[PDB]
A paper describes a structure:
The enzyme, being a homodimer, is strongly conserved among the prokaryotic and eukaryotic species, from bacteria to mammals. A feature distinguishing mammalian from bacterial TS enzymes is N-terminal extension by some 27 amino acid residues, present in the former but absent in the latter enzymes. However, that protein segment is usually disordered and thus absent in the crystal structures of a mammalian TS.
The crystal structure of mouse thymidylate synthase (mTS) in complex with dUMP and Raltitrexed comprises two homodimers, AB and CD, consisting of chains A, B, C, and D, represented by continuous and (overall) well-defined electron densities for amino acids 21–307, 20–307, 21–302, and 21–304, respectively. The ligands, dUMP and Raltitrexed, are described by clear electron densities in all subunits. Moreover, considering noticeable electron densities between mTS Cys189 γS and dUMP C6 in the subunits A and B, including continuous electron density at 1.8σ in the latter subunit, the presence of the γS-C6 covalent bond in some fraction of the population of mTS-dUMP-Raltitrexed molecules may be expected. In addition, in accord with more closed conformation of the dimer AB than CD, the C-terminal segment that contributes to the active site closing and enzyme catalysis is described by a well-defined electron density throughout the segment in the former, in contrast to a weaker electron density, resulting in the lack of a few most terminal residues in the latter.
Author numbering:
A (entry chain B): 1 to 13, 20 to 307
B (entry chain A): 1 to 13, 21 to 307
């Protein structure tokens, strides 16, 4: 039968961050329903989940399997620069978007004429140029559309009480040009007691592959914005729509659920950075990260 | 102290209604003081979720009567694409009149705008996302993305799709809105022939708007389930800044001591084929035996 580490206890929906994730996995295995999907693989699925990860002197990079930190960091810097060229990320040894920008994938979507790598008007473009007319991944979009990311930063500084501190990549007008509509549809920031928190609405979560990387990604973004606004990191709240385990991840996750978590690492920012675009890979240091080995989770395409 | 009905038990995230009451309890117990736009002040928590079954019941709160006439009229008004508060007010539903008032509009710099013109809010975004807003009574036929109809068509053709979203949050249009949407987006989901809906609500006035909003999205899900031949499943309510305005604390403490009753049922009285064809007379709420309304003032 399904056997799990004794520390999970009740999986039913802060402290002990990693257990929040492992309990969601357990809950989907135990209570999820079979749901067919776009890729033809099949999933077990639950609709509507929420987990809270404290960011207060800890950073939620999972320890029950090693997570691809280099990729998390490169990807987020790539978003920040407004990039939608998967080849530019791949040149940093981070190949996570290559499959979606491939000649054969793009062709399957009917995007014959665009260049390989061109993901269309996805996060980088929507976060920094929302509403601008997308042309291609090489076009200069300087001063075009809404720079949501800077606006969030400016609002946190001037009116931290504001309940409208949102960055949204879901753009119905642009959806048909995207190689993958965004899994992270929107995030909201919140300030109380000198702490910055972030909530992600993730419409679709591949619990074995993307979700651990995604948690680390928004935790990092929150650390970055906290740094620039002179706040301390608070909580990362992870909300999921279709939370799913692909059938070929069931056995790998069952290995993972039996591993003892270790304490989370810390993230250090190594200098005073004044603006979000000035961050560089050399500015960050993960300390004390002691994960169990990688478990291969294949990507369904 | 805070005293509450015995059936709430643990407020940590039987009845669907108890999940609302437990949220309210939780904010009073654990919430932090936070100042706000209206000047009123709140007790606040960031990030909550609750799940309301829609299976042979309808989540209209029984611990305090909820303005059902207004829920229904408002949703019909959204579906028509309207952003004109006067057209809702004419139905006896005044819930948007303050936001559309001469004085409030002027407070935002919209002195040249007609009273009642809420800007490019829900009706416009749901039916015309991406179109260029002019004014509330302009002709937007065929302009922008009809997200509502796209949702319905996707549920019919590809119920497993993980992209079935309607989003009112439009960064380009926000400066023209009299109030940026409290309901930023919603997502639909299908499994085992049941339709569920999740709402992302960025800001929830727990005393006033949130009970009304719960009923709004439940009703939407009932409508869409009907048109698509599915059964209603769950309504999942997700909150950003979940707050209690200071002048609602004592009214909500009254509420929390009332005994919940079973939820009512919602009946759809005829076969309706298109979303646009629903009318007030197509619905009946049966078995609604609430405790009396508690006045919760609207801030700003
Ligand atoms: C079905 C699917 N699931 C996903 O999670 C997904 C994620 C992305 C983008 N993304 C956010 C990521 C893609 C791959 C990642 C990753 O962490 N890879 C690790 C582990 C690989 C493995 O275990 O197979 C690595 O490459 O080392 S993180 C794109 C398409 C997707 N499609
Ligand atoms: C601060 C604020 N809180 C709100 O909840 C809010 C809600 C709307 C829109 N909306 C969705 C609603 C407004 C009023 C409602 C309502 O249920 N009214 C009842 C109860 C009134 C009362 O208790 O004072 C009614 O009119 O009978 S529902 C607009 C601005 C807002 N502003
Ligand atoms: O950062 C991301 C990008 C995507 N996905 C997953 C969710 C789905 O398994 C798949 C996207 O497929 P659709 O939901 O669009 O079908 O990738 C993630 O988990 N995180
Ligand atoms: O349907 C709605 C509309 C608004 N609000 C509340 C939340 C806030 O109390 C207020 C909006 O104020 P801001 O969050 O925009 O400041 O109205 C709701 O609860 N539901």
């Amino acid at each position: 039968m399904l056997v799990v580490g004794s520390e999970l206890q009740s999986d039913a929906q802060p402290r002990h961050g990693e257990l929040q994730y492992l309990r969601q996995v357990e809950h989907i295995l135990r209570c999820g329903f079979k749901k067919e999907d776009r890729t033809g693989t099949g999933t077990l699925s639950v609709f509507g989940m929420q987990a809270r990860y404290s960011l207060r002197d800890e950073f939620p990079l999972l320890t029950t399997k090693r997570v691809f930190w280099k990729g998390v960091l490169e990807e987020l810097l790539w978003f920040i620069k407004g990039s939608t060229n998967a080849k530019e990320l791949s040149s940093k040894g981070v190949r996570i978007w290559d499959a979606n920008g491939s000649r054969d994938f793009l062709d399957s979507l009917g995007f014959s004429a665009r260049q390989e790598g061109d993901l269309g008007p996805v996060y980088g473009f929507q976060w920094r140029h929302f509403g601008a007319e997308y042309k291609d991944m090489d076009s200069d979009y300087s001063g075009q559309g809404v720079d949501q990311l800077q606006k969030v930063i400016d609002t946190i500084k001037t009116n931290p009480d504001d309940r409208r501190i949102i960055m949204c990549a879901w753009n119905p007008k642009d959806l048909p040009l995207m190689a993958l509509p965004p899994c992270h549809a929107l995030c909201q920031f919140y300030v109380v007691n000198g702490e910055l928190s972030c909530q992600l609405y993730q419409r679709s979560g591949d619990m074995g592959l993307g979700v651990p990387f995604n948690i680390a990604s928004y935790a990092l973004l929150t650390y970055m914005i906290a740094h620039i606004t002179g706040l301390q990191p608070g909580d990362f709240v992870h909300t999921l729509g279709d939370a799913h385990i692909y059938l070929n991840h069931i056995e790998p996750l069952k290995i993972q659920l039996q591993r003892e978590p270790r304490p989370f690492p810390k993230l250090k920012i190594l200098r005073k950075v004044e603006t979000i675009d000035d961050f560089k890979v050399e500015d960050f240091q993960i300390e004390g990260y002691n994960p169990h080995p990688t478990i291969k989770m294949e990507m369904a395409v």
